[PDB]
DNA sequence: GACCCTATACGCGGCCGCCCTGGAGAATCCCGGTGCCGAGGCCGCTCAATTGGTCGTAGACAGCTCTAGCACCGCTTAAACGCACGTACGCGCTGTCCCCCGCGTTTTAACCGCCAAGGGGATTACTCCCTAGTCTCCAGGCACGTGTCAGATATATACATCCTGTTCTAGAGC
DNA sequence: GCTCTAGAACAGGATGTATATATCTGACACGTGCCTGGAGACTAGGGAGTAATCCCCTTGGCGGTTAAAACGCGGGGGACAGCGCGTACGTGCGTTTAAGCGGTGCTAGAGCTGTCTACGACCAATTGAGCGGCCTCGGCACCGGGATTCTCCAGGGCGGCCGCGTATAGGGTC
């Protein structure tokens, strides 16, 4: 989460940062797969066929 | 009448709503719908604000995940537009 | 070599039980791979269950608990 | 010689393998695969016959359900064949 | 399961009958959705597009 | 047998759709400036733990023993894997008219600010009836023997569908 | 008007699934021989119920303001398929081939038996920081300003296809 905040430059850990940290690590992704994180959103992933 | 392409603003909105964590369904209609659904179970039932909040967070997360699954079904079927058959297939795959 | 020990007609019969009319030729390797992944997960869970009991043989019983802890409970054992 | 159209033998196989619950996967290759997988975690590891049976039943039921979802995705994509992308989509929706 | 065995022209319940009974009825299938029955098989159903 | 005319394919020039490049309106990121409300730090103070010995014990443990899984012995018949012909289709392109998206406008209800206010979650003083533990045992309950009838494997024969043969009638040709 | 090609539907033969015994090993379940486990009944004190505030907090009521949703509107996008196809499985085979099953050990191992030492909530008691509450402070929310670039219109380069010039082999003629 601190690394994700560093990529975002905020000095405070946000639930978005925690969600990004959880869903970015693969092991944490399979461990916390059926788990909802409030005020976290999702990763900004776009398919290649959707992009022009 | 400068007009953007039908599908560039779609991607821009996708990026905006994926980067931001602000909630999408307004709190009052969701609260009213929750009360309508719960009035068939318990007569004169009260909902605290945090209960409705948590229910809203869970509902938007479930809808968002289902929307990613239906979008993946759409691209899998060589398609861009999602259709209710995608939602039915996604529900039946998980056995809902 | 036992990964290829399972047969293409066995996979065909498995798809027939799943109500599939026809099977593409390049899906056999993918089915073998996902079967290997599933068996690896279940066997890892069963191995941990067996090692916890100071046991050197994987009984049937901790196997069905390993499957049930994964949301895939087994009946009849 | 007599010739059968592509599909009626497939439908007959579907019917005859759905009425009966025989063991489609042979005992010896599945047992050998189980021993090969387990030998990387623990050396000199034994498997009783009922354990192999149970694991084979669970694997066969899981693969049958996965093939059902794969065929479901194929019909959703207006396709008769089942492709590895269909299995990937079914596993992704199922979170595997 | 006994009803399914009666449709199977036999008077002894065997696990295929139990699986058919579980999967045929809605509430028991929903209760046992993540439940696998050995020696049970699946429902004998064919999709509409598969039939000629 | 040699000369001239003619049809056919190879090489070269021209054109147009395809594939790109700037101008400018507008969405998004960095920054100047402020703030105020949420986060970090401090004053009591009040609630769970650990050291000083504890004891029946959940676990641990050497000899034993008892049901059985792995290794390979010939095979035996369900089978699988290499190959050839063909008809089901996967998927690039196809025209288009219906379906979805993007600014404009209005209106429409959501978010907000403050307060009555009446039903509802929390815990203290006290009580109760219903629940853990223990003494004895008997009728419900677990494990071995065994008759046989439900089920499993199987041959033969009947009803049902696919198919190839054939007869008939319609229509083109002379 | 006479001769004859070809499409169309039952007629019988082939094949498939299915009923009917024929039968045969095979375990279902009663009988029995025990057997261990809660039923009956004190002992009683610990958790739950009742209340009893209590507050508290969520529902409703005054709107104000405004981000956003509903209203069609307009041009671009593209979802749902028909055709040719070729291409990758479907469906047959002869051949492996390796999987299914059974008798005889055999000791790895899982309990199993009776035996042996260490081990954790409590017997009673703090105590030292967890947390409620208050003080302070700072960093992203908010408001604009500005830069960078996203990206839609309305102009410049580039290669494939068609028409034409021309070399060349085949046929006609003396």
UniProtKB/Swiss-Prot annotation, chain C:
Q: How is it modified after translation?
A: Demethylation is performed by JMJD6. Monomethylation is performed by KMT5A/SET8. Trimethylation is performed by KMT5B and KMT5C and induces gene silencing.
Glycyl lysine isopeptide (Lys-Gly) (interchain with G-Cter in UFM1) crosslink location in chain: 8
What Gene Ontology terms describe what this protein does at the molecular function level? DNA binding; protein heterodimerization activity; structural constituent of chromatin
Phosphotyrosine carried by residues: 28, 65
Q: Which residues carry this modification: Phosphoserine?
A: 24
Q: Which keywords fit this entry according to its UniProt record? A: Acetylation, Chromosome, Citrullination, DNA-binding, Hydroxylation, Isopeptide bond, Methylation, Nucleosome core, Nucleus, Phosphoprotein, Ubl conjugation
A GO cellular-component term linked to this record: nucleosome
One record GO biological process: nucleosome assembly
* N6-butyryllysine: residues bearing it: 8, 21, 54, 56, 68
Residue numbers carrying N6-(2-hydroxyisobutyryl)lysine: 8, 21, 36, 54, 56, 68
Localization per Swiss-Prot or TrEMBL? Nucleus; Chromosome
N6-lactoyllysine carried by residues: 8, 54, 68
Give residue numbers for the modification (N6-glutaryllysine).
8, 36, 54, 56, 68
Q: Which residues carry this modification: N6-succinyllysine?
A: 8, 54, 68
Q: Does the keyword Ubl conjugation apply?
A: yes
Q: Which residues carry this modification: N6-acetyllysine?
A: 8, 36, 56, 68
Q: N6-propionyllysine is carried by which residues?
A: 8, 21, 54, 56, 68
Residues of crosslink Glycyl lysine isopeptide (Lys-Gly) (interchain with G-Cter in ubiquitin)? 68
Q: What does this protein do?
A: Core component of nucleosome. Nucleosomes wrap and compact DNA into chromatin, limiting DNA accessibility to the cellular machineries which require DNA as a template. Histones thereby play a central role in transcription regulation, DNA repair, DNA replication and chromosomal stability. DNA accessibility is regulated via a complex set of post-translational modifications of histones, also called histone code, and nucleosome remodeling.
Question: Member of which family?
Answer: Belongs to the histone H4 family.
Q: How does it assemble?
A: The nucleosome is a histone octamer containing two molecules each of H2A, H2B, H3 and H4 assembled in one H3-H4 heterotetramer and two H2A-H2B heterodimers. The octamer wraps approximately 147 bp of DNA.
The protein's name in its UniProt record: Histone H4
Residues of the whole record sequence present: 25 to 101 of 103
